[PDB]
Amino acid sequence: LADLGRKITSALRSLSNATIINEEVLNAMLKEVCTALLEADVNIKLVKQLRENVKSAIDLEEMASGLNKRKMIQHAVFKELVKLVDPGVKAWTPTKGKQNVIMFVGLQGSGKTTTCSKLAYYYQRKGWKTCLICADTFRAGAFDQLKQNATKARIPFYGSYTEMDPVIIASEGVEKFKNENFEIIIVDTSGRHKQEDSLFEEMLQVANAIQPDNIVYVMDASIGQACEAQAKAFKDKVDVASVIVTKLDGHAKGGGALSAVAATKSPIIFIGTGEHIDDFEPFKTQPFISKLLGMGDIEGLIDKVNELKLDDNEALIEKLKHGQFTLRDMYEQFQNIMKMGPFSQILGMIPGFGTDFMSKGNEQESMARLKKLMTIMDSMNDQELDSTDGAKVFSKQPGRIQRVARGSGVSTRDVQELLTQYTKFAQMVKKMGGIKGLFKGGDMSKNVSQSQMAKLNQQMAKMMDPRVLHHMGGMAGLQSMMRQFQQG
RNA sequence: GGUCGGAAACGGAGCAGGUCAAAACUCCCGUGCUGAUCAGUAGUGGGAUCGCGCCUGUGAAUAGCCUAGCGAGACCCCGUCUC
Ligand SMILES: Nc1nc2c(ncn2[C@@H]2O[C@H](COP(=O)(O)OP(=O)(O)O)[C@@H](O)[C@H]2O)c(=O)[nH]1
Incomplete structure (x- = not known):
């Protein structure tokens, strides 16, 4: 949401930074935590329930004086939110080597059409073999939309323009794809409302014909009070075990999702805040609440870095210490940046300034602009990529700039800008190599001295940018965050 | 890949990497010329030729040998004289 968390985060800061904390401060700070929940479309009775749940969870009346009050008061509300969002039932996860079929309803x-592509692309990126099934025969041009999205996501799909019965086409698609031993088979079902009994029974017919391993219900975040009535009715007929929340960018912020969880006792697997297929984020329970309290996930980021799994770390270190930074290494670093995933999630997980800093309006196309860097650099040959310094060689023969512009677009100014960026990065790497022993390997210098670390910190603080270093936390804050990444 | 045209299909130039019966350069074997390095390769022209096997005659010559004597002297004996 990136807005409720700020309000809730400011409510916890109001409770803290006070010469004293009595029974009046708690209530005062609880009012700010209630108003924020009310703005999140949550029922007033549930809000009055969380307020009473945290009141009994932290009694200052007979609280053993001497124990951290704030620490156990901020943790009392963190458990409340987590509980408020956790159903308590373990989710379903497909197994390797077995055909798992998932049916989508909503x-x-x-x-649902975009959700199929998002889930299929996520599993394909993770390494799963997936295929698409289009069992929509009521929406006009639904198969065309699914086909174009699938060929955009290079994911196999099945369907037919002329077939009108969704049961037969879905069943035959599953039967066809089970022959070639496909692991994940997701079937796209047409839209349906509980008021219409014909499609209501068609849903049971397709469910019995397919027998999905898990039923996923798609719920928009912009709907209001009408969510519970349809969700309970849908669950009463089919075995819904998980749900997916979409349109997180909407103003309604999915306030009915909490009541849906309290009703169905099922968790949300993923959330999507963008129309584009690549916009697909997990809904891990503990990290989501930890984001709301300025306690960003550290395990998730290190897991992502481990997924990056750099092949070697010794030859790179000795290259850096000698002050060599080539173009091919820069291209590999950019490739790792692209493979790192969405850019917003990287800085959303940090405990730093906040998660509502990466705006979708401009940085989404800024990533595509950065994509042009690899296009420009792909015109470089092996000699240029492996050269010690590209600026020196590029300053001797201008015709190589023309050759590069041949493969790419104009690039007359773009190549010069890329060379300036490479020169700045090369000087940064030269300084990092001149720090004289801040890297692993070689000698057994496991512990780093404070003097060399201070010199490196001074060098780092002088070249990043203004207005972001001051809010980062200063030198002490930056070093503490780096230590957090070390231990975490 | 990117880029340009085209609603699309598709088409043009062309970079990164790779390929050669058809840009150019160069190497090897062979061919022609030119040098230098050369000895368990011949061939007479000399030098040299106490030893070497060498093809050889016409001749009567070549090799091997050649203490003692004389004149004077102490004591003794033999003859003569004196007291
Ligand atoms: N804002 C926002 N819109 C979304 C998201 N996901 C899907 N949509 C919208 O949903 C529409 C497609 O809905 P559709 O698949 O046809 O629903 P169905 O007819 O029930 O299958 C698209 O026009 C998108 O604009 C999301 O994460 N955020």
Whole structure:
């Protein structure tokens, strides 16, 4: 949401930074935590329940004086939110080497067609073999939309323009794809409302014909009070075990999702805040709440870095210490940046300034602009990529700039800008190599001295940018965050 | 890949990497010329030729040998004289 967390985060800061904390401060700070929940479309009775749940969870009346009050008061509300969002039932996860079939249900316009592509692309990126099934025969041009999205996501799909019965086409698609031993088979179902009994029974017919391993209900975040009535009715007929929340960018912020969880006792697997297929984020329970309290996930980021799994770390270190920074290494670093995933999630997980800093309006196309860097650098040959310094060689023969511009677009100014960026990065790497022993390997210098670390910190603080270093936390804050990444 | 045209299909130039019966350069074997390095390769022209096997005659010559004597002297004996 990136907005409720700020309000809730400011409520916890109001409770803290006070010469004293009595029974009046708690209530005062609890009012700010209630108003924020009310703005999140949550029922007033549930809010009055969380307020009473945290009141009994932290009694200052007979609280053993001498124990951290704030620490156990901020943790009392963190457990409340987590509980408020955790159903308590373990989710379903497909097994390797077995055909797992997932059936999607939801209302019209919920985004099931896009959800199929998002889930399929996520599993394909993770390494799963997946295929698409289009069992929509009521929405006009639904198969065309699914086909174009699938060929955009290079994911196999099945369907037919002329077939009108969704049961037969879905069953035959599953039967066809089970022959070639496909692991994940997701079937796209047309929109449906509980008021219409014909499609209501068609849903049971397709469910019995396919027998999905798990049923996923797609719920938009912009709907209001009408969510519970349809969700309970849908669960009463089919075995819904998980749900996916879409349109997180909406103003309604999915306030009915908490009541849906309290009703169905099922968790949300993923959330999507963008129309684009690549916008797909997990809904891990503990990290989501930890983000709301300025306690960003550290395990998730290190897990992502481990997924990056750099092949070697010794030859790179000795290259850096000698002050060599080539173009091919820069291209590999950019490739790792692209493979790192969405850019917003990288800095969202840090305990730093906040998660509502990466705006979708401009940085989404800024990533595509950065994509042009590899296009420009792909015109470089092996001699240029492996050269010790590209600026020196590029300053001797201008015709190589023309050759590079041949493969790429104009690039007359773009090549010069890329060379300036490479020169700045090369000087940064030269200084990092001149720090004289801040890297692993070689000698057994496991512990780093404070003097060399101070010199490196001074060098780092002088070249990043203004207005972001001051809010980072200063030298002490930056070093503490780096230590957090070390231990975490 | 990117880029340009084209609603699309598709088409043009062309970079990164790779390929050669058809840009150019160069190497090897062979061919022609030119040098230098050369000895368990011949061939007479000399030098040299106490030893070496060498093809050889016409001749009567070549090799091997050649103490003692004389004149004077102490004591003794033999003859003569004196007291
Ligand atoms: N804002 C936002 N819109 C979304 C998201 N996912 C899907 N949509 C919208 O959902 C529409 C597609 O819905 P559709 O798949 O046809 O729903 P269905 O007819 O029930 O299958 C698209 O026009 C998107 O604009 C999301 O994460 N954020």
